[PDB]
RNA sequence: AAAGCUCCUUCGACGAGUCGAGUAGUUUGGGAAUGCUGCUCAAAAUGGGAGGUAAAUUUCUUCUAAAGCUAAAUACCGGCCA
RNA sequence: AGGUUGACCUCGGAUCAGGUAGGAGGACCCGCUGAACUUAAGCAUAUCAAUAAGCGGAGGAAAAGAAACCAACAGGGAUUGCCCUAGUAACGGCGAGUGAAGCGGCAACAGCUCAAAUUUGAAAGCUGGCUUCGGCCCGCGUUGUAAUUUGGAGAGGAUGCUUU
């Protein structure tokens, strides 16, 4: 942590106190991916397969319409970040489908 | 009753001072319970898995063949959760598993596992990827055959 | 502005029961004190600093001591509420000053604490013996362990040879410069990046 | 455990397997009664995570409710007043169909206490729920300390007062700035804000 | 192996000749992803690929919920 | 229809262990 | 037999027609959506929510939703006793 | 005997054995539904009012409640109530009018429990009946009842004292 400047204005403003590095709280470990969680999710992906909108996005990504696929993913999921993450996931799926073959 | 007799024997054993492990031996039984069998398959301790074909809701066991194939466990779908319950002293049993057996039944377990491997799994390898259903009713099939015969004659 | 355009008369609250409620509160307080004797009627609270720039000059009492404060004081988290120490699992120590102050407060409390045995027949090692179980005690931890210095001392005397030299350029100029740098942190970064990109393009 | 696999599979509701199961179960539940008893939960992982135990005293009822909005029960669609209150269609009930199903199941079973409920299926006309109820007069329930809180008379008809999960959501009982009007009770907060406090030495 | 009677069309539903791409039914049936699905399947099989017979397992590591004593 | 005294006073095993090893002590603070 | 304290290579499961988005009605001081509900779409794994001006990019700070219990301070034109 | 004998699953019957619910009261409390008179020259936004009436559900209190919080600080730390914030921010034919929240002082303070883990060297858990009160049976349950864990952590390992 950068020491504060001891002023009320500007960059790094505030009273000078000696900072402490804390051990990370266990509630902040949410989102960290576990080994058994990866295994269960991959097996369930194998059993279930693709959703219809995922199949449409996969068709668009094979055809190369990346912008159209991201627009469709945004219209389907709701937000730009979720659309981007889903498109990257389906790029990963297509890449590992074609690469190891 | 057998558990009660064993508990009285172990209580006597700890009464004169020897541990319960001196009087009681390692038990070999059929492992049952869905969560227990799933954990055994995940830890790759189960030697043979027998799944029941008539479990509802089917999501309880629909992933079990895929999990057994992914861990390389010999599995077999068998008829009768009540029949497995007769094994495990319950009314029903969704899945049973053999992990270890006694020394005199190693050959029998190996022959049963090999019998499963070349008698069930190799035959169902093609069929397990194939969709079911699609069967027409009796009158629908009769109308279809009549129409097909008329088209062939015409 | 007078807001009486609703049916206000059926929700008028009068406070004729103010002394009766005060007497009821005092009765409850004395009953709780008698039930909790010889322990104090309230639990020990840490010294915390108030949020925002308006109130960070003042310190007050917190909800409870943190787990790190209890660990550094040596008081286990399952023992502290049983000996009268409030525990807060939400609060964190981001600086050493509050941590040291609260650890010293906990050590003072543990030094002034008398622990009667669970069974008087078998006194344990942590339990206080009957020889010094008898001492002058307190019943209000809010009064005995209060906020001694809520605010910094506003008057301090220094000798004339230790007058500080001062910020170079002046304090007003320093404040104006700090505000200017805070407002221009981004434009300067763009111009540095553009100069670096131009140098890279021109090789 | 298998229930992690059931949870991850139940997350995938648009897959072919889950779609087929949902279709056949929706047909079966539509052929059954509007309110009936399920011998076992059709979603055991969901029931377990909502509180169902395989113990004598925990009972599962399946229920379907008609979906859509709420139409005013006014005669011939005429609302007699100002035109801003004159709308009849496109009006929405302020509680969930899950809560309506919970009240109907609780009225069916007046001796039991509605613990919770969950979605199992839906079509164009109906939404289907399975409701978990606890028997407060059963000795196992009264001796289990994890569930014997519901035996107290303060928990009579939780679904009729909104003390279930859907009731708390509909009442907006959440901490934060977005729930300023409703986090402690909307009418109670309104009365606190609208009361006139006159002291003695004012 | 005891097998039941099975209808004539035994694959996934498909109408790949149709050009319409509107709707969930069109996305399920008109879209042809058989090459991708076969790639997933063959990759999964490549990953999968007396006492010896009993203890013979696959090459994947064991998955544990917790460290158990 | 009220719960029995024993049924209302039943506690979990973890609560029993916690109360056994860490009960509400009797203490005092010196002035 | 159970229980706490100290340290640590490693592990560390955490709630889905739910969150969220669009639209409609209603509501709010909440104003390019404050809350609720209906319909449609429909998630993710350092992920998700929030950070009171809509959007992209890069950061930061907070908590950890979709399961549940819990006395006191609080209200009281009903009942009983003063 | 196998055209037989049974085991399960689902759905029923019984004046079966044992229990529970209804109605009252409703000042206060938790929700649903929901006006108009009135005030703005009149008036369909608005106001009255998220009120009256109507409906469902509790208790001595109810509800809320141990952060998917507030904040932007040198950080506070479950809920509730009072004083202040403040007739302020904000909303509104920006008109009539409407209208919070953070911080701060006080009153009172108390924390917790499940799901997601294999006890697997032993369903260790529970309802009911008969008891001679030692227990024994009929069952529930492995599609999961005990112990363990809950994010503050914990699980495993080391370690030496304490604890009942």
mmCIF file of C-alpha atoms in Angstrom, chain E residues 3-67:
data_model
loop_
_atom_site.group_PDB
_atom_site.id
_atom_site.type_symbol
_atom_site.label_atom_id
_atom_site.label_comp_id
_atom_site.label_asym_id
_atom_site.label_seq_id
_atom_site.Cartn_x
_atom_site.Cartn_y
_atom_site.Cartn_z
ATOM 1 C CA UNK E 3 -32.791 -54.250 -25.908
ATOM 2 C CA UNK E 4 -36.288 -52.858 -26.484
ATOM 3 C CA UNK E 5 -38.037 -52.265 -29.779
ATOM 4 C CA UNK E 6 -36.891 -49.053 -31.459
ATOM 5 C CA UNK E 7 -38.399 -46.810 -34.120
ATOM 6 C CA UNK E 8 -37.041 -46.170 -37.589
ATOM 7 C CA UNK E 9 -35.381 -42.768 -37.035
ATOM 8 C CA UNK E 10 -32.881 -43.209 -34.223
ATOM 9 C CA UNK E 11 -30.692 -40.098 -34.453
ATOM 10 C CA UNK E 12 -31.156 -36.579 -33.145
ATOM 11 C CA UNK E 13 -34.021 -34.594 -34.741
ATOM 12 C CA UNK E 14 -32.780 -32.712 -37.785
ATOM 13 C CA UNK E 15 -34.224 -30.726 -40.682
ATOM 14 C CA UNK E 16 -30.901 -29.437 -42.030
ATOM 15 C CA UNK E 17 -32.299 -28.758 -45.515
ATOM 16 C CA UNK E 18 -34.548 -25.997 -44.163
ATOM 17 C CA UNK E 19 -33.101 -22.464 -44.451
ATOM 18 C CA UNK E 20 -35.060 -20.768 -41.660
ATOM 19 C CA UNK E 21 -32.996 -19.671 -38.653
ATOM 20 C CA UNK E 22 -35.785 -18.108 -36.571
ATOM 21 C CA UNK E 23 -36.713 -19.663 -33.246
ATOM 22 C CA UNK E 24 -35.565 -22.358 -30.846
ATOM 23 C CA UNK E 25 -36.965 -25.146 -33.035
ATOM 24 C CA UNK E 26 -35.004 -23.834 -36.022
ATOM 25 C CA UNK E 27 -31.856 -23.555 -33.901
ATOM 26 C CA UNK E 28 -32.256 -27.153 -32.712
ATOM 27 C CA UNK E 29 -33.145 -28.803 -36.011
ATOM 28 C CA UNK E 30 -31.993 -26.683 -38.967
ATOM 29 C CA UNK E 31 -28.496 -26.029 -37.602
ATOM 30 C CA UNK E 32 -25.914 -28.686 -38.490
ATOM 31 C CA UNK E 33 -23.297 -29.113 -35.742
ATOM 32 C CA UNK E 34 -22.547 -32.836 -36.202
ATOM 33 C CA UNK E 35 -18.859 -32.226 -36.953
ATOM 34 C CA UNK E 36 -18.413 -30.219 -33.738
ATOM 35 C CA UNK E 37 -20.331 -32.770 -31.648
ATOM 36 C CA UNK E 38 -18.284 -35.641 -33.096
ATOM 37 C CA UNK E 39 -15.127 -33.673 -32.291
ATOM 38 C CA UNK E 40 -16.242 -33.359 -28.661
ATOM 39 C CA UNK E 41 -17.084 -37.069 -28.540
ATOM 40 C CA UNK E 42 -13.790 -38.246 -30.050
ATOM 41 C CA UNK E 43 -11.803 -35.946 -27.753
ATOM 42 C CA UNK E 44 -13.693 -37.331 -24.751
ATOM 43 C CA UNK E 45 -12.960 -40.915 -25.832
ATOM 44 C CA UNK E 46 -9.276 -40.050 -26.336
ATOM 45 C CA UNK E 47 -9.204 -38.567 -22.821
ATOM 46 C CA UNK E 48 -10.876 -41.711 -21.433
ATOM 47 C CA UNK E 49 -8.406 -44.001 -23.236
ATOM 48 C CA UNK E 50 -7.529 -61.422 -11.168
ATOM 49 C CA UNK E 51 -6.294 -58.589 -8.962
ATOM 50 C CA UNK E 52 -5.143 -56.673 -12.049
ATOM 51 C CA UNK E 53 -8.655 -56.958 -13.520
ATOM 52 C CA UNK E 54 -10.163 -55.774 -10.220
ATOM 53 C CA UNK E 55 -7.770 -52.844 -9.785
ATOM 54 C CA UNK E 56 -7.644 -51.768 -13.436
ATOM 55 C CA UNK E 57 -8.808 -48.157 -13.757
ATOM 56 C CA UNK E 58 -8.463 -45.246 -16.157
ATOM 57 C CA UNK E 59 -5.636 -42.708 -16.231
ATOM 58 C CA UNK E 60 -7.610 -39.756 -14.848
ATOM 59 C CA UNK E 61 -6.748 -38.715 -11.266
ATOM 60 C CA UNK E 62 -9.170 -39.365 -8.432
ATOM 61 C CA UNK E 63 -11.474 -36.510 -7.404
ATOM 62 C CA UNK E 64 -11.953 -35.977 -3.663
ATOM 63 C CA UNK E 65 -14.407 -33.692 -1.876
ATOM 64 C CA UNK E 66 -11.996 -33.260 1.057
ATOM 65 C CA UNK E 67 -8.768 -34.488 2.574
#
